[PDB]
Amino acid sequence: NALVATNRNFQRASRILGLDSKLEKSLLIPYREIKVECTIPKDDGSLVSYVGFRIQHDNARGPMKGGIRYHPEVDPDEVNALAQLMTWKTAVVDIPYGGAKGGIGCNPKDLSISELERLTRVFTQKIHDLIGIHRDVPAPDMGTNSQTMAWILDEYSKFHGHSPAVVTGKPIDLGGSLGREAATGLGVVFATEALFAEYGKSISDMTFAIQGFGNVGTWAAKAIFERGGKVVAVSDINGAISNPNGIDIAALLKHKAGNGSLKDFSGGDAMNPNDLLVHDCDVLIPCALGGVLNKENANDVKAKFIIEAANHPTDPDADEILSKKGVIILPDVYANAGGVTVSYFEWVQNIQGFMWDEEKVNQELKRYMTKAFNDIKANCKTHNCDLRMGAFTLGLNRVARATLLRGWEA
Amino acid sequence: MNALVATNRNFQRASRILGLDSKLEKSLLIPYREIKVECTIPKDDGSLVSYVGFRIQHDNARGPMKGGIRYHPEVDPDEVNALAQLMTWKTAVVDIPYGGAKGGIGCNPKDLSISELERLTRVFTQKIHDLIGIHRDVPAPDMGTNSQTMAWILDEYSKFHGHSPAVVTGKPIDLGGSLGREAATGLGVVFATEALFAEYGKSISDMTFAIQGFGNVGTWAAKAIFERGGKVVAVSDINGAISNPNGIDIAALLKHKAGNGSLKDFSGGDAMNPNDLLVHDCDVLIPCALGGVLNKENANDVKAKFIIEAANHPTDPDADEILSKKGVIILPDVYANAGGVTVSYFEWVQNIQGFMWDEEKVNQELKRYMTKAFNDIKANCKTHNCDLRMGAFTLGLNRVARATLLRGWEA
Amino acid sequence: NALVATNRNFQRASRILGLDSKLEKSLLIPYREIKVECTIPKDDGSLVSYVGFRIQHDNARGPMKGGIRYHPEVDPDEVNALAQLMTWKTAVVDIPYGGAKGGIGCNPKDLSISELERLTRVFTQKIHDLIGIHRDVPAPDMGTNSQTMAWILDEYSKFHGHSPAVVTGKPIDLGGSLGREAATGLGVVFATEALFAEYGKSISDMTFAIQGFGNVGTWAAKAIFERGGKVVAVSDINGAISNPNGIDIAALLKHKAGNGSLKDFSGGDAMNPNDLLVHDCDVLIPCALGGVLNKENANDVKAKFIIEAANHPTDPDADEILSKKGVIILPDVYANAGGVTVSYFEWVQNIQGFMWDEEKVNQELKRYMTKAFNDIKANCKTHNCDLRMGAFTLGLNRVARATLLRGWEA
Ligand SMILES: [Ca+2]
Ligand SMILES: [Ca+2]
Ligand SMILES: [Ca+2]
Ligand code: NA
Ligand code: NA
């Protein structure tokens, strides 16, 4: 549902900035769209043919950036919207990139691992002249992973020499960054610390409920727990657990790790996962699916803060119902941006030919997230708007300023 | 345009102090490459105008060439060659890894609409993109150009060689420009003055100051002096001048100037003839706006014991000798105002590293480079038994000669 | 010499890791081997013709790296062995390079300084397309120096633009790094500090005997002395000096820069240089020749620690005898790796366009040597082997794992 959410947010932000109508149309037209044939021999010799693609939306603020999806469902308009969302998101946290999105229309469960490698190399052979370290830097996405990126790196480097910075999300052995897996969860916590400091409160003052215990949910709960937060309720798709004292997340992660369901963790009480969103607590954090907060449950939300860790968790309905209940909402486009920020740091480390240790990675993540919250809050004063429009006007205005500085003559 | 005559004198004096071989000297004088190119554009009404762009690339033994782009009608080649050469010594004095270049277009930018300036800048870039580059020659603003010009150079250059933020410096902050660029020259003057006064066991707070000029350099230098307990007793704008025997609240004066206040109106002092600032009774004199201001007449009448040359070439040769025989220590322009090119190097470094620095780090590095440079100059003065000006020119000249001789001469 | 040791170490390590024989065969085949004609006119105008060469062994972890030898004796077997050692060695200290080794079969004593410059520029003209800042980075070796690297830099840059990072060992004026002279000796001491910390001891608790007083011996002794170590015996080629309370290394370095032979030192008693290895100390540090620990003298060694600062000081019979006696041996491939680590830092500083101060160089040297020891020790625990196999399995496995991540499809 990124399509309708990004278009509404762009439109509302554009109207706040008063963007000139002809600049807006240019900003909406992608820099370049590419489709290429990817034919490979299967392991038995016979042929399969797919179409690979790359939408390169904008590069006014620097090289394009975004994921590669190996997925059968390819809608050109959703891909355009995701690339465009990367352009705004990078500008919100002031990393020097524009947005792109690409992939191949295939089902990776139909392909062996040798076939996946051959497909990835042929894709790279078909697009290498269109990507690059200062041109367009791919990353994992639905259906791809760090091993995919190793194959892209290896094949790209035959055409342009050894180029570690041409992709992010690489394995550690080949130039990947430390702290990549925790970065989104940890960034969520850094961002909430900045928000709470605006009221002179800190994380150790609050109770939290967390919906989803995936990559973001586990790391976000770890970071809250180590900073003195009381996590009082944790949900995932199966079961859920609560504890008004605060759940021992350290123990809960160990329990999940040894193949344990939440519902049978001894350090809490089993609860219905459908009751998580309306749990009694200070802060709610959706980390699972989007659109879970609508107008049927919005008035029932007990939290006074919503940290949008998942993408698009609250719809327009709830956004207003909660806004007049006094609930402050920290928007997805900013709050979960620790991922793209550390992927930038990976690219920096490769460019500088010298890796950072993990303390340095987390030190800069915190600097970037804190500085972005202050820029957002400053915009909310200038335009007297909520934090979601502070964020979008910030990124949109930064892309517009760079576009206008660069000019239009040939 | 004393830059021609002054750069030539100083090179000759320094070369003799070093005893440079005459064949090496000849090579050092010949620029690496001189380029002129046709730049023709359609005006807003479609009619054609034709200009000649140029780039003098003087020397690259110590690294990529570096220098400004001038949109100015006067384009004497001997002067453009001298400016490029001066940049080769200046980068060497502060030990940043560049050589010298200078370029421009023979045009008057007041004849050109803003769209015509852009087309002209883009065509100029089309004609020289193969001659500049991150590790080859890095242009910068100068008379008639600014950060907008640099953005256009960047935008057009990147069409030919890919996104290349480091190909120009002086970029807008939004396109990879560095923090602390604007204060860099004035702030650097103060760092250099602190290092000079440490040789006497004195400090900026021990002194009173007269500052000539309230432009980019004068304002920031006065602010840095004032925040270090220095007493600024006289400031000279182009329009007026202001006085105070006990110090001018530079902070309030900055507020007055910002709200469009003429210097002679600032209530926290009283007026002064600006044509008399150079002979104010002060410990330190800092010319900032204009050069050529100290000649055979005013020389014996100067009061200060120190002259910090923030402006370019403010001291005539005649005045250099007369002031020296009066015991006046002159911190030379080629070093004193080098903060600008030094921070332009840091901008290039930040672009190269793909990761910007905060302003604290920029200024820490600026202080380290200016301080090390003064220590190296002072050491040369001790080695060669010369004043600070020859200390600087021998340091820079020697560094370029050493790099040249290391690289060698076989094909 | 180096050939026999490297081959043995490789097989033992491969057997420990259980490397697949097909992978092993690939790992042993060099990526590329090059021979080029190098003809120049002599100062008198007549022609001499030489053969230049470059063995590029492996680049799965990054650009190849290694010395250029101007030497009449060209053994392709040992050239291959040295390039391959560089591949394992860089992996041991987690430096992002592979191994290469090159040279020109000539006697530099027959050539004037202008003829040497012409030979170096012509060699560069013949291999410029095969080397590069991210492809293969040469360095000094026997018969070449920093002036030689200056010529490679100047000629290479005519073809690919100003490229400071294409060679290391450059003059300081042309982008060379600080800290290079002390780097190997100081690295030896850093590595020895890390080992003793595992037993809860300090440098100040030990007595040391040091064989050899060249670049490595002088800096190693200087650094041991500063950290509180008692250097009770020092030998060179012409004699040796002893002092049970400790030799004043500072005063010994003064006497040596005054062209004073060791045995004429007033702050010690002259001993037989051939009794250094069996001198009564806690720690032996060979810094002169290889093979000086053989099956004859190995049983007489009284030190409980041997720090291999020289290349290949103990043959394998001595390894076995000293192990039974409880001697712990810090292996050469790790202990003396400070040289190649600082050369990496020179490349890093060039790539970043901004040089470091010597304090930062030595700070990073310490971080790298200390991390490598920790990685080595961890490996000794998994495979339950001595430190020497801990080091070779660590580096071998890093090259294997990078090779396997990159894959084999075209
Ligand atoms: Ca020349
Ligand atoms: Ca013509
Ligand atoms: Ca032939
Ligand atoms: Na028109
Ligand atoms: Na001759």
Short mmCIF file of N, CA, C and O in Angstrom, two decimals, chain A residues 249-342:
data_model
loop_
_atom_site.label_atom_id
_atom_site.label_comp_id
_atom_site.label_asym_id
_atom_site.label_seq_id
_atom_site.Cartn_x
_atom_site.Cartn_y
_atom_site.Cartn_z
N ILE A 249 13.74 -8.85 27.99
CA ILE A 249 13.94 -9.10 26.57
C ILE A 249 15.18 -9.94 26.35
O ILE A 249 15.22 -10.77 25.43
N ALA A 250 16.21 -9.76 27.17
CA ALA A 250 17.40 -10.61 27.08
C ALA A 250 17.01 -12.08 27.18
O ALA A 250 17.40 -12.91 26.35
N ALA A 251 16.19 -12.42 28.18
CA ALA A 251 15.71 -13.80 28.32
C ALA A 251 14.80 -14.19 27.16
O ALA A 251 14.86 -15.32 26.67
N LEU A 252 13.95 -13.27 26.71
CA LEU A 252 13.00 -13.59 25.65
C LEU A 252 13.71 -13.87 24.33
O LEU A 252 13.28 -14.74 23.57
N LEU A 253 14.79 -13.13 24.04
CA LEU A 253 15.55 -13.38 22.82
C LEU A 253 16.23 -14.74 22.86
O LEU A 253 16.25 -15.47 21.86
N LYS A 254 16.79 -15.11 24.02
CA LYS A 254 17.35 -16.44 24.20
C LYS A 254 16.28 -17.51 23.98
O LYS A 254 16.54 -18.52 23.32
N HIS A 255 15.07 -17.28 24.50
CA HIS A 255 13.98 -18.24 24.35
C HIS A 255 13.54 -18.36 22.90
O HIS A 255 13.35 -19.47 22.39
N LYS A 256 13.36 -17.23 22.22
CA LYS A 256 13.03 -17.27 20.79
C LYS A 256 14.12 -18.00 20.01
O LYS A 256 13.82 -18.75 19.07
N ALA A 257 15.38 -17.79 20.40
CA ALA A 257 16.51 -18.34 19.65
C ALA A 257 16.53 -19.86 19.70
O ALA A 257 16.81 -20.50 18.68
N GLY A 258 16.24 -20.45 20.85
CA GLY A 258 16.21 -21.89 20.99
C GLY A 258 14.92 -22.51 20.49
O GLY A 258 14.49 -23.57 20.98
N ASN A 259 14.30 -21.85 19.50
CA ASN A 259 13.06 -22.29 18.87
C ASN A 259 11.91 -22.34 19.88
O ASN A 259 11.28 -23.37 20.10
N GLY A 260 11.66 -21.19 20.49
CA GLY A 260 10.58 -21.05 21.45
C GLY A 260 9.52 -20.05 21.00
O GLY A 260 9.84 -18.95 20.55
N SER A 261 8.26 -20.45 21.10
CA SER A 261 7.16 -19.54 20.81
C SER A 261 6.99 -18.56 21.96
O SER A 261 7.24 -18.89 23.13
N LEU A 262 6.57 -17.34 21.63
CA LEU A 262 6.32 -16.33 22.65
C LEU A 262 5.34 -16.83 23.71
O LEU A 262 5.57 -16.66 24.92
N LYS A 263 4.24 -17.45 23.27
CA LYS A 263 3.13 -17.80 24.16
C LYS A 263 3.56 -18.69 25.33
O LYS A 263 2.86 -18.73 26.34
N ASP A 264 4.69 -19.39 25.21
CA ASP A 264 5.14 -20.31 26.25
C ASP A 264 6.43 -19.85 26.92
O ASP A 264 7.12 -20.66 27.55
N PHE A 265 6.76 -18.56 26.80
CA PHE A 265 7.86 -17.98 27.55
C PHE A 265 7.46 -17.84 29.02
O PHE A 265 6.39 -17.31 29.34
N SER A 266 8.32 -18.32 29.91
CA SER A 266 7.99 -18.35 31.34
C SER A 266 8.06 -16.98 32.00
O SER A 266 7.55 -16.83 33.11
N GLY A 267 8.68 -15.98 31.37
CA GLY A 267 8.82 -14.68 32.00
C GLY A 267 7.70 -13.70 31.72
O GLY A 267 7.91 -12.49 31.71
N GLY A 268 6.49 -14.21 31.50
CA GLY A 268 5.37 -13.34 31.23
C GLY A 268 4.08 -14.12 31.18
O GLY A 268 4.00 -15.26 31.64
N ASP A 269 3.06 -13.48 30.61
CA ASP A 269 1.72 -14.05 30.52
C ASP A 269 1.28 -14.09 29.07
O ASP A 269 1.55 -13.16 28.30
N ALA A 270 0.61 -15.17 28.69
CA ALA A 270 0.13 -15.30 27.32
C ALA A 270 -1.08 -14.40 27.12
O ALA A 270 -2.00 -14.39 27.94
N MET A 271 -1.07 -13.63 26.03
CA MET A 271 -2.14 -12.71 25.69
C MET A 271 -2.50 -12.87 24.22
O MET A 271 -1.73 -13.41 23.42
N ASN A 272 -3.69 -12.37 23.87
CA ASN A 272 -4.19 -12.45 22.50
C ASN A 272 -3.48 -11.41 21.63
O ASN A 272 -3.60 -10.22 21.91
N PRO A 273 -2.76 -11.82 20.58
CA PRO A 273 -2.03 -10.83 19.77
C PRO A 273 -2.91 -9.76 19.16
O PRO A 273 -2.41 -8.67 18.86
N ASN A 274 -4.21 -10.02 18.99
CA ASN A 274 -5.10 -8.99 18.47
C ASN A 274 -5.37 -7.88 19.48
O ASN A 274 -5.88 -6.83 19.08
N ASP A 275 -5.05 -8.08 20.75
CA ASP A 275 -5.21 -7.03 21.76
C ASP A 275 -3.96 -6.18 21.94
O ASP A 275 -3.94 -5.32 22.83
N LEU A 276 -2.91 -6.38 21.14
CA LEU A 276 -1.68 -5.65 21.40
C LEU A 276 -1.85 -4.16 21.13
O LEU A 276 -1.53 -3.33 21.98
N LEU A 277 -2.38 -3.81 19.95
CA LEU A 277 -2.47 -2.40 19.56
C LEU A 277 -3.21 -1.54 20.58
O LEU A 277 -2.96 -0.34 20.68
N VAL A 278 -4.12 -2.13 21.35
CA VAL A 278 -4.90 -1.34 22.30
C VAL A 278 -4.46 -1.67 23.72
O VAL A 278 -5.23 -1.53 24.68
N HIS A 279 -3.21 -2.11 23.87
CA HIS A 279 -2.66 -2.38 25.18
C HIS A 279 -2.50 -1.07 25.95
O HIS A 279 -2.33 0.01 25.36
N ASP A 280 -2.56 -1.17 27.28
CA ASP A 280 -2.36 -0.01 28.15
C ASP A 280 -0.86 0.21 28.35
O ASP A 280 -0.19 -0.61 28.99
N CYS A 281 -0.34 1.29 27.79
CA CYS A 281 1.09 1.56 27.83
C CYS A 281 1.33 2.99 27.35
O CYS A 281 0.42 3.64 26.83
N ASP A 282 2.57 3.45 27.51
CA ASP A 282 2.92 4.81 27.12
C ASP A 282 3.18 4.91 25.62
O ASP A 282 2.73 5.87 24.97
N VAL A 283 3.90 3.95 25.05
CA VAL A 283 4.38 4.04 23.68
C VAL A 283 3.99 2.76 22.94
O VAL A 283 4.19 1.66 23.45
N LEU A 284 3.42 2.92 21.75
CA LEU A 284 3.11 1.80 20.87
C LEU A 284 4.07 1.81 19.68
O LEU A 284 4.41 2.88 19.16
N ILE A 285 4.52 0.63 19.26
CA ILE A 285 5.49 0.52 18.17
C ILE A 285 5.08 -0.58 17.20
O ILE A 285 5.41 -1.76 17.43
N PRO A 286 4.38 -0.27 16.11
CA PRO A 286 4.10 -1.28 15.07
C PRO A 286 5.36 -1.63 14.30
O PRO A 286 5.98 -0.76 13.69
N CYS A 287 5.73 -2.91 14.32
CA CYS A 287 6.91 -3.42 13.62
C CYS A 287 6.59 -4.51 12.61
O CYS A 287 7.51 -5.14 12.10
N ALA A 288 5.31 -4.77 12.34
CA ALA A 288 4.95 -5.93 11.55
C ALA A 288 4.34 -5.43 10.24
O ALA A 288 5.09 -4.99 9.35
N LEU A 289 3.03 -5.46 10.08
CA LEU A 289 2.39 -5.05 8.85
C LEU A 289 1.93 -3.60 8.95
O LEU A 289 2.00 -2.97 10.01
N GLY A 290 1.48 -3.07 7.82
CA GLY A 290 0.93 -1.74 7.76
C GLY A 290 -0.59 -1.77 7.79
O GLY A 290 -1.22 -2.82 7.74
N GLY A 291 -1.18 -0.57 7.88
CA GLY A 291 -2.62 -0.43 7.90
C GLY A 291 -3.30 -1.12 9.06
O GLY A 291 -4.53 -1.25 9.07
N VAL A 292 -2.52 -1.57 10.05
CA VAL A 292 -3.08 -2.19 11.24
C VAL A 292 -3.84 -1.19 12.10
O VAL A 292 -4.73 -1.58 12.87
N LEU A 293 -3.52 0.10 11.99
CA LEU A 293 -4.21 1.15 12.72
C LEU A 293 -5.17 1.86 11.77
O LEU A 293 -4.74 2.62 10.89
N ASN A 294 -6.46 1.60 11.93
CA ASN A 294 -7.51 2.21 11.13
C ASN A 294 -8.46 2.96 12.04
O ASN A 294 -8.14 3.20 13.21
N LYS A 295 -9.65 3.32 11.56
CA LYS A 295 -10.56 4.08 12.40
C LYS A 295 -11.44 3.20 13.29
O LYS A 295 -12.15 3.74 14.15
N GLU A 296 -11.42 1.88 13.11
CA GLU A 296 -12.18 1.00 14.00
C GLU A 296 -11.53 0.85 15.36
O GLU A 296 -12.23 0.65 16.37
N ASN A 297 -10.19 0.95 15.42
CA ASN A 297 -9.44 0.77 16.66
C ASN A 297 -8.71 2.02 17.12
O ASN A 297 -8.14 2.01 18.22
N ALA A 298 -8.74 3.11 16.33
CA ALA A 298 -7.93 4.28 16.65
C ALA A 298 -8.35 4.93 17.96
O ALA A 298 -7.50 5.32 18.77
N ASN A 299 -9.65 5.07 18.19
CA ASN A 299 -10.10 5.67 19.44
C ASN A 299 -9.77 4.81 20.65
O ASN A 299 -9.74 5.32 21.77
N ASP A 300 -9.52 3.51 20.43
CA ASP A 300 -9.21 2.56 21.49
C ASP A 300 -7.73 2.50 21.81
O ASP A 300 -7.33 1.75 22.71
N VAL A 301 -6.90 3.24 21.09
CA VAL A 301 -5.47 3.21 21.36
C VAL A 301 -5.21 3.92 22.68
O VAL A 301 -5.61 5.07 22.87
N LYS A 302 -4.52 3.22 23.58
CA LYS A 302 -4.22 3.76 24.90
C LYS A 302 -2.88 4.49 24.94
O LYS A 302 -2.66 5.29 25.86
N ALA A 303 -2.00 4.24 23.98
CA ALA A 303 -0.69 4.87 24.01
C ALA A 303 -0.79 6.35 23.67
O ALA A 303 -1.69 6.79 22.95
N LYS A 304 0.15 7.12 24.22
CA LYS A 304 0.28 8.54 23.92
C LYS A 304 1.37 8.83 22.90
O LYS A 304 1.54 9.99 22.50
N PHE A 305 2.10 7.81 22.46
CA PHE A 305 3.14 7.91 21.44
C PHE A 305 3.06 6.69 20.53
O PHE A 305 2.93 5.56 21.02
N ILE A 306 3.15 6.91 19.22
CA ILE A 306 3.24 5.83 18.25
C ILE A 306 4.53 6.01 17.47
O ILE A 306 4.75 7.06 16.84
N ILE A 307 5.39 4.99 17.51
CA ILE A 307 6.66 4.97 16.78
C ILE A 307 6.47 4.05 15.57
O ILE A 307 6.41 2.83 15.71
N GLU A 308 6.35 4.63 14.38
CA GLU A 308 6.05 3.86 13.17
C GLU A 308 7.33 3.19 12.69
O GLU A 308 8.06 3.72 11.85
N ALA A 309 7.60 2.00 13.23
CA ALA A 309 8.74 1.21 12.78
C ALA A 309 8.43 0.48 11.48
O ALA A 309 9.27 0.45 10.57
N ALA A 310 7.25 -0.11 11.38
CA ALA A 310 6.80 -0.65 10.11
C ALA A 310 6.47 0.48 9.15
O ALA A 310 6.34 1.65 9.54
N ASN A 311 6.34 0.14 7.87
CA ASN A 311 5.98 1.13 6.87
C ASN A 311 4.46 1.17 6.70
O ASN A 311 3.82 0.13 6.52
N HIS A 312 3.90 2.38 6.77
CA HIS A 312 2.48 2.71 6.61
C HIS A 312 1.58 1.98 7.60
O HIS A 312 0.66 1.28 7.19
N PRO A 313 1.80 2.13 8.92
CA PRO A 313 0.99 1.37 9.88
C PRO A 313 -0.30 2.06 10.26
O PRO A 313 -1.22 1.42 10.78
N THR A 314 -0.40 3.37 10.02
CA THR A 314 -1.59 4.14 10.36
C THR A 314 -2.15 4.79 9.10
O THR A 314 -1.40 5.41 8.34
N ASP A 315 -3.44 4.66 8.88
CA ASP A 315 -4.05 5.25 7.69
C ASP A 315 -4.51 6.67 7.98
O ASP A 315 -4.42 7.15 9.12
N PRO A 316 -4.96 7.40 6.96
CA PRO A 316 -5.50 8.76 7.20
C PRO A 316 -6.55 8.85 8.28
O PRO A 316 -6.53 9.80 9.07
N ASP A 317 -7.49 7.90 8.33
CA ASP A 317 -8.49 7.86 9.39
C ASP A 317 -7.83 8.00 10.76
O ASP A 317 -8.04 8.99 11.47
N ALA A 318 -7.02 7.00 11.12
CA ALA A 318 -6.43 6.97 12.45
C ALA A 318 -5.54 8.18 12.69
O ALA A 318 -5.54 8.75 13.79
N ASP A 319 -4.81 8.61 11.65
CA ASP A 319 -3.89 9.74 11.80
C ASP A 319 -4.58 10.96 12.39
O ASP A 319 -3.97 11.72 13.15
N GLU A 320 -5.85 11.14 12.07
CA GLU A 320 -6.60 12.25 12.65
C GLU A 320 -7.24 11.89 13.98
O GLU A 320 -7.19 12.69 14.92
N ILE A 321 -7.85 10.70 14.07
CA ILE A 321 -8.46 10.27 15.33
C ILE A 321 -7.43 10.29 16.45
O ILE A 321 -7.73 10.68 17.59
N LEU A 322 -6.20 9.88 16.15
CA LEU A 322 -5.16 9.88 17.17
C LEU A 322 -4.59 11.27 17.38
O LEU A 322 -4.18 11.61 18.50
N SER A 323 -4.58 12.09 16.33
CA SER A 323 -4.05 13.44 16.45
C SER A 323 -4.89 14.29 17.40
O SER A 323 -4.35 15.12 18.14
N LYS A 324 -6.20 14.11 17.40
CA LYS A 324 -7.01 14.87 18.34
C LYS A 324 -7.17 14.18 19.69
O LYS A 324 -7.56 14.85 20.66
N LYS A 325 -6.86 12.89 19.80
CA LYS A 325 -6.69 12.27 21.11
C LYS A 325 -5.41 12.72 21.81
O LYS A 325 -5.19 12.35 22.97
N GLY A 326 -4.57 13.50 21.13
CA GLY A 326 -3.32 13.96 21.70
C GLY A 326 -2.14 13.05 21.46
O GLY A 326 -1.06 13.30 22.01
N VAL A 327 -2.30 12.02 20.64
CA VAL A 327 -1.22 11.07 20.40
C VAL A 327 -0.22 11.68 19.43
O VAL A 327 -0.60 12.19 18.37
N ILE A 328 1.05 11.63 19.79
CA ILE A 328 2.12 12.07 18.89
C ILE A 328 2.58 10.86 18.08
O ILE A 328 2.82 9.78 18.64
N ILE A 329 2.70 11.03 16.77
CA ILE A 329 3.07 9.95 15.87
C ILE A 329 4.41 10.28 15.23
O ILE A 329 4.56 11.34 14.60
N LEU A 330 5.39 9.38 15.40
CA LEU A 330 6.71 9.52 14.77
C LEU A 330 6.70 8.77 13.44
O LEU A 330 6.58 7.53 13.45
N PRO A 331 6.84 9.45 12.31
CA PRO A 331 6.47 8.85 11.02
C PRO A 331 7.50 7.86 10.48
O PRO A 331 8.71 8.01 10.65
N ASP A 332 6.97 6.85 9.78
CA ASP A 332 7.78 5.77 9.23
C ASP A 332 8.95 6.30 8.41
O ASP A 332 10.10 5.88 8.61
N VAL A 333 8.68 7.24 7.50
CA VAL A 333 9.72 7.70 6.58
C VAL A 333 10.97 8.13 7.33
O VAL A 333 12.09 7.95 6.83
N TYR A 334 10.82 8.63 8.55
CA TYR A 334 11.98 8.96 9.39
C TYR A 334 12.36 7.83 10.34
O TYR A 334 13.52 7.42 10.37
N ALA A 335 11.39 7.32 11.10
CA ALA A 335 11.70 6.50 12.27
C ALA A 335 12.44 5.21 11.91
O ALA A 335 13.33 4.78 12.66
N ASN A 336 12.10 4.56 10.79
CA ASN A 336 12.79 3.32 10.45
C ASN A 336 13.99 3.52 9.52
O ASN A 336 14.48 2.54 8.95
N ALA A 337 14.47 4.75 9.35
CA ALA A 337 15.48 5.03 8.33
C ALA A 337 16.90 4.64 8.75
O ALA A 337 17.84 4.93 8.01
N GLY A 338 17.08 4.02 9.93
CA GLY A 338 18.40 3.53 10.31
C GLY A 338 18.99 2.54 9.32
O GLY A 338 20.20 2.52 9.11
N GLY A 339 18.15 1.73 8.69
CA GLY A 339 18.61 0.84 7.64
C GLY A 339 19.33 1.54 6.50
O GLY A 339 20.48 1.19 6.19
N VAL A 340 18.69 2.53 5.86
CA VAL A 340 19.33 3.16 4.71
C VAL A 340 20.53 3.96 5.16
O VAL A 340 21.50 4.10 4.42
N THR A 341 20.51 4.47 6.40
CA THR A 341 21.64 5.23 6.91
C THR A 341 22.88 4.36 7.07
O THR A 341 23.97 4.73 6.61
N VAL A 342 22.75 3.16 7.66
CA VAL A 342 23.95 2.34 7.80
C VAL A 342 24.39 1.77 6.46
O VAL A 342 25.59 1.55 6.25
#
